[PDB]
Structure 1
Amino acid sequence: MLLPWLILIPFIGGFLCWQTERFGVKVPRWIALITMGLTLALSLQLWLQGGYSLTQSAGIPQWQSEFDMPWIPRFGISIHLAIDGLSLLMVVLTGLLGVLAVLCSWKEIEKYQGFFHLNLMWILGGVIGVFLAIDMFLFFFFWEMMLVPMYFLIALWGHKASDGKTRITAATKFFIYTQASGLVMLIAILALVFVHYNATGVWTFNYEELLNTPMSSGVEYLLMLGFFIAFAVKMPVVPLHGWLPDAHSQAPTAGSVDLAGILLKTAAYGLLRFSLPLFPNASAEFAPIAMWLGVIGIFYGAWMAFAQTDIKRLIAYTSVSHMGFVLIAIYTGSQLAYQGAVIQMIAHGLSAAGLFILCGQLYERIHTRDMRMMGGLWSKMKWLPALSLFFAVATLGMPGTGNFVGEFMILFGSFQVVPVITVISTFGLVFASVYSLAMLHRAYFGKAKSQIASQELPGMSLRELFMILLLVVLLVLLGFYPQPILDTSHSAIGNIQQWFVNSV
């Protein structure tokens, strides 16, 4: 009975940010900050009062909190929200990144900034709704409801140095990819619901009731394929990764929309909740193909990230490789690999969010993004190159940061399942180190390759430094003491894994 407020506080806050622009041009940033602070504090309240650490695995379904309300009773569709440890971790993560995205868009005081904050909070509310929806139609509705504000934020408030048509092309390509994947998901959902209706005789879109639906091997494989295509576009999984570097590069130059919509990965959670339990035999049959796609994604993203002359495209391909690691973790049958996948998702979110914030600060300081044109910037700034070195160290897979923890439990569980793919993924870790060193070399080390690089740049403000240091502290504490996160996710992950293993 608290989750609808988790979804509706961002929407009401976005409406208030649009409406309060007439009171003052610098008003709606404060309203967005207050609403995202309320959402984050309420997520932390759900964490504190949920008692997730003492919760054991009991089998799907098992929700710490729930809410049901009829929406389209002709089809048996209800607004049905449910929270357990995994969804709560993702909701806390998107609340924190929403606060960071509001704080990152500070000191951008222009006309129609209230609308910018409106699409920001609508994206974040859609992300929360994706995490909390446990029925197919509302999950698809939030899956595709986030994309219109994302499209308009990319296309209208995007990179001001772009042609104006390149932003349109990137936003349209991203929208077409995500919406076509969503429509394939809707076909799979509809066919699953119709198979359930033919089997029993009732109409329902509910995930608890759609579980244990009897179907043949080919039908289950096709439904798995539709779900996996939808989740493979948004993870991204190669060759469906083409939207992500173009969307990241042409996004607003603050970087707030990256953290709000593109950086957070609902596709791995979607695979965990709606692909392994619903079609476990089909997922077991598809596991070699998905794990090899994850291997190819890791190495492809590494080779792309080394070859990029732009920072934002480089970080986008880092995201591609890290979600290749997560996709390898998903299709195993180990609880250790899944727990590492959860840690990897959270830590990659924090690390790449810090990377995108620092790239936005670097661009707002030096007004370029070409790595071949700047260099030797350690001596020219106060705080930015050291923090960028730390975040490249974190994305490199270094102990003391949560990324190492995440991908190493991923590799431990995967080796317990499949040794060869683990071997090739560890060589992918070598490649990740390679591109991190290459970005650090081409960006901050050496002699300055242009006159703007050979000039003294003002230091970062208290706000940007404080939020980057908050990200740093969170990453270090996750690296050294990951036990609260593992204890929160343990019950949900045990439910998903125990469902996946004995039904095949």
Structure 2
Amino acid sequence: MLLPWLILIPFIGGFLCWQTERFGVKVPRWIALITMGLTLALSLQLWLQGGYSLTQSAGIPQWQSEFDMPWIPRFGISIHLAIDGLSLLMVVLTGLLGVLAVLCSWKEIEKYQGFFHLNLMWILGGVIGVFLAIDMFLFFFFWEMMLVPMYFLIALWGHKASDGKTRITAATKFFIYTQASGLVMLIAILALVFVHYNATGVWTFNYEELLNTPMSSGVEYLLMLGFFIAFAVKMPVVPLHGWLPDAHSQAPTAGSVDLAGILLKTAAYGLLRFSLPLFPNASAEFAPIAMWLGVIGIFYGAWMAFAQTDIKRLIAYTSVSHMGFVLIAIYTGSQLAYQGAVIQMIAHGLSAAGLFILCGQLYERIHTRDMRMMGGLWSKMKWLPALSLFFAVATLGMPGTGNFVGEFMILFGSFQVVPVITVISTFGLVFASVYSLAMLHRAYFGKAKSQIASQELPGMSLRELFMILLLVVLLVLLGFYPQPILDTSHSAIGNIQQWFVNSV
């Protein structure tokens, strides 16, 4: 019931930020803040009223809330939303990151701020719709709908220091990758729908009805291959990964647009929700390839991030390595590894949000991003280097932050399933510590090798410090007490794991 409002409130809010620019340039930021606060409040109200902690696993489908409306009755297409523990967790994370993104661009008084805010809210609404839709056409619709505002934000409101041609090139590369992968996913969806139509005679796109689809061996492999191409481009999984550092480099200066659409794990959610229950045997056979791809992605992202002279590209390849960890977790078939994957995804979103916000604030202070131009910044900034030290400590898998709980439950489940990939991924954790230390010592420690890093810099504002400390508090509380997050998503993970291991 509240899910259509959960999707439409960002869209109506973005339309309001566009329309209320005539009353002032400082108005659409307040409107966007109000509507993301309303979205987050609705998500938290769904969390409180759901009773997710006391919910027990009953098998797919099992939704805490469900909405149906016919959209295209010729193909049996419905605007069909459904929320359970995992989807609610991702919706809450999306709302929190949207509030952080709206706050992160609070000092932009540009003449066209209203369209920027509409663009951001439409990205957030598309991400929420991806997390909520259980109709194949609607899920694909939101999946490709959240990319046009992404493209326009990167291309027009991107990094002003870089040339326009590089911004358009990076945005076009990102759009081409994501939309071609979405098209392949659509072809897999259509072939699955047609297989179900020949087997049954009923036109439908519903996830619940397409679950019991009798398919031969080889067709199911192709369908899961298309789904995995989409969910591996947007994860990212190597070699389908260059769009992520190219778009992070040319992202807008404040870093809000990084948090809005690039930083939310829609692809791994789709792997958990759509790839494994619909195609269990084919995913079971593709598990070694995906797990070795995750190992190669971890080490490729580590060696990439160590060799990066750009901070934003370093955080992008950190995201690549941690998403490789999640990809290893997803194809294990273990409840403990799945719960660790959920915790790791939430904690990695929080840590990368803190890292990108601190990098944006640092670029506001110093107007450069090259590691050969900073050094010894601890003595010049009041708050930024210690908070960045905390967040780089979080991204190396340090206990006390939720990332450690994430990768360690992932590796416990993986060692229960596959030990060699577990031990190689732990060496990947060593590599993660290596590049985090390299970034810390190239950025804030040492002696200054530039003139702009030889002067005293102004301290951070109250709102940026407040939101970064909020991220710090959330990461620490997730590291020390991850139990409410674990009990929130216990039923959905249980249903997915039981459906995966009971149909092989």
TM exceeds 0.5?
Answer: yes
Tell me how far apart the structure 2 counterparts of residues 371 and 260 of structure 1 sit (CA, whole Å).
26
Point out 4+ residue stretches in structure 1 off by more than 6 angstroms: none
Shift of 1:333: 1.1
Tell me how far apart the structure 1 counterparts of residues 494 and 28 of structure 2 sit (CA, whole Å).
42
Q: Deviations over 1:244-301 (max 9, x none)?
A: 0010010001000000010111000000000000000000000000000000000000
1:219 corresponds to 2:222:
no
Q: Deviations over 1:136-161 (max 9, x none)?
A: 00000000000000000000000010
Q: Deviations over 1:288-345 (max 9, x none)?
A: 0000000000000000000000000000000000000000000011100000000000
Q: Deviations over 1:55-90 (max 9, x none)?
A: 000000000000000000000000000000000000
RMSD (Å), alpha carbons: 0.3
Aligned to 2:103: 103
Shift of 1:201: 0.4
Aligned to 1:245: 245
Report the secondary structure of 2:31's partner residue: helix
Report the secondary structure of 1:53's partner residue: coil
Tell me how far apart the structure 1 counterparts of residues 178 and 21 of structure 2 sit (CA, whole Å).
31
Shift of 1:96: 0.1
Tell me how far apart the structure 1 counterparts of residues 43 and 341 of structure 2 sit (CA, whole Å).
21
Tell me how far apart the structure 2 counterparts of residues 139 and 314 of structure 1 sit (CA, whole Å).
31
Report the secondary structure of 1:187's partner residue: helix
Report the secondary structure of 1:23's partner residue: coil
Tell me how far apart the structure 2 counterparts of residues 372 and 73 of structure 1 sit (CA, whole Å).
60
Report the secondary structure of 1:403's partner residue: helix
Tell me how far apart the structure 2 counterparts of residues 484 and 46 of structure 1 sit (CA, whole Å).
15
Shift of 1:431: 0.1
Aligned to 1:48: 48
Tell me how far apart the structure 2 counterparts of residues 293 and 107 of structure 1 sit (CA, whole Å).
41
Report the secondary structure of 1:491's partner residue: helix
Report the secondary structure of 2:286's partner residue: helix
Tell me how far apart the structure 2 counterparts of residues 209 and 23 of structure 1 sit (CA, whole Å).
49
Tell me how far apart the structure 1 counterparts of residues 210 and 502 of structure 2 sit (CA, whole Å).
18
Report the secondary structure of 1:80's partner residue: strand
Gaps of 5+ in 2: none
Q: Deviations over 1:25-62 (max 9, x none)?
A: 11000000000000000100000000000000000000
Tell me how far apart the structure 1 counterparts of residues 372 and 392 of structure 2 sit (CA, whole Å).
18
Q: Deviations over 1:417-454 (max 9, x none)?
A: 00000000000000000000000000000000101100
Aligned to 2:141: 141
Tell me how far apart the structure 1 counterparts of residues 212 and 289 of structure 2 sit (CA, whole Å).
24
Tell me how far apart the structure 2 counterparts of residues 280 and 25 of structure 1 sit (CA, whole Å).
52
Tell me how far apart the structure 1 counterparts of residues 490 and 303 of structure 2 sit (CA, whole Å).
34
Q: Deviations over 1:322-369 (max 9, x none)?
A: 000000000011100000000000000000000000000000000000
Tell me how far apart the structure 2 counterparts of residues 111 and 146 of structure 1 sit (CA, whole Å).
24
Shift of 1:2: 0.6
Tell me how far apart the structure 2 counterparts of residues 44 and 191 of structure 1 sit (CA, whole Å).
38
Aligned to 2:259: 259
Tell me how far apart the structure 2 counterparts of residues 328 and 344 of structure 1 sit (CA, whole Å).
12
Tell me how far apart the structure 1 counterparts of residues 92 and 129 of structure 2 sit (CA, whole Å).
13
Shift of 1:382: 0.1
Tell me how far apart the structure 2 counterparts of residues 169 and 154 of structure 1 sit (CA, whole Å).
10
Tell me how far apart the structure 1 counterparts of residues 60 and 171 of structure 2 sit (CA, whole Å).
38
Tell me how far apart the structure 1 counterparts of residues 334 and 14 of structure 2 sit (CA, whole Å).
41
Aligned to 1:70: 70
Tell me how far apart the structure 1 counterparts of residues 286 and 399 of structure 2 sit (CA, whole Å).
33
Aligned to 1:3: 3
Q: Deviations over 1:478-502 (max 9, x none)?
A: 0000000000010000000000001
Aligned to 1:491: 491
Tell me how far apart the structure 1 counterparts of residues 334 and 374 of structure 2 sit (CA, whole Å).
45
Q: Deviations over 1:66-123 (max 9, x none)?
A: 0000000000000000000000000000000000000000011011100000000000
Report the secondary structure of 1:79's partner residue: strand
Aligned to 2:412: 412
Shift of 1:372: 1.1
Tell me how far apart the structure 2 counterparts of residues 41 and 270 of structure 1 sit (CA, whole Å).
25
Tell me how far apart the structure 1 counterparts of residues 265 and 303 of structure 2 sit (CA, whole Å).
22
1:502 corresponds to 2:502:
yes
Shift of 1:373: 1.1
Report the secondary structure of 1:396's partner residue: coil
Aligned to 1:342: 342
Q: Deviations over 1:450-471 (max 9, x none)?
A: 0110000000000000000000
Shift of 1:210: 0.1
Report the secondary structure of 1:66's partner residue: strand
Aligned to 2:284: 284
Report the secondary structure of 1:251's partner residue: coil
Q: Deviations over 1:124-180 (max 9, x none)?
A: 000000000001000000000000000000000000101111000000000000000
Tell me how far apart the structure 2 counterparts of residues 172 and 409 of structure 1 sit (CA, whole Å).
38
Shift of 1:212: 1.5
Gaps of 5+ in 1: none
Seq. identity, %: 100
Q: Deviations over 1:232-251 (max 9, x none)?
A: 00000000001000100100
Report the secondary structure of 1:21's partner residue: coil
Aligned to 2:124: 124
Tell me how far apart the structure 2 counterparts of residues 241 and 265 of structure 1 sit (CA, whole Å).
14
Tell me how far apart the structure 1 counterparts of residues 128 and 137 of structure 2 sit (CA, whole Å).
15
Q: Deviations over 1:195-234 (max 9, x none)?
A: 0000000000000000010000100000000000000000
Number of residue pairs matched? Answer: 504
Tell me how far apart the structure 2 counterparts of residues 54 and 419 of structure 1 sit (CA, whole Å).
33
Report the secondary structure of 1:81's partner residue: strand
Tell me how far apart the structure 1 counterparts of residues 238 and 137 of structure 2 sit (CA, whole Å).
27
Tell me how far apart the structure 2 counterparts of residues 110 and 421 of structure 1 sit (CA, whole Å).
49
Report the secondary structure of 2:60's partner residue: coil
Tell me how far apart the structure 1 counterparts of residues 251 and 119 of structure 2 sit (CA, whole Å).
13
1:364 corresponds to 2:364:
yes
Q: Deviations over 1:357-401 (max 9, x none)?
A: 000000000000001111100000100000000000000100000
Tell me how far apart the structure 2 counterparts of residues 140 and 302 of structure 1 sit (CA, whole Å).
31
Aligned to 2:273: 273
Aligned to 2:384: 384
Report the secondary structure of 2:257's partner residue: helix
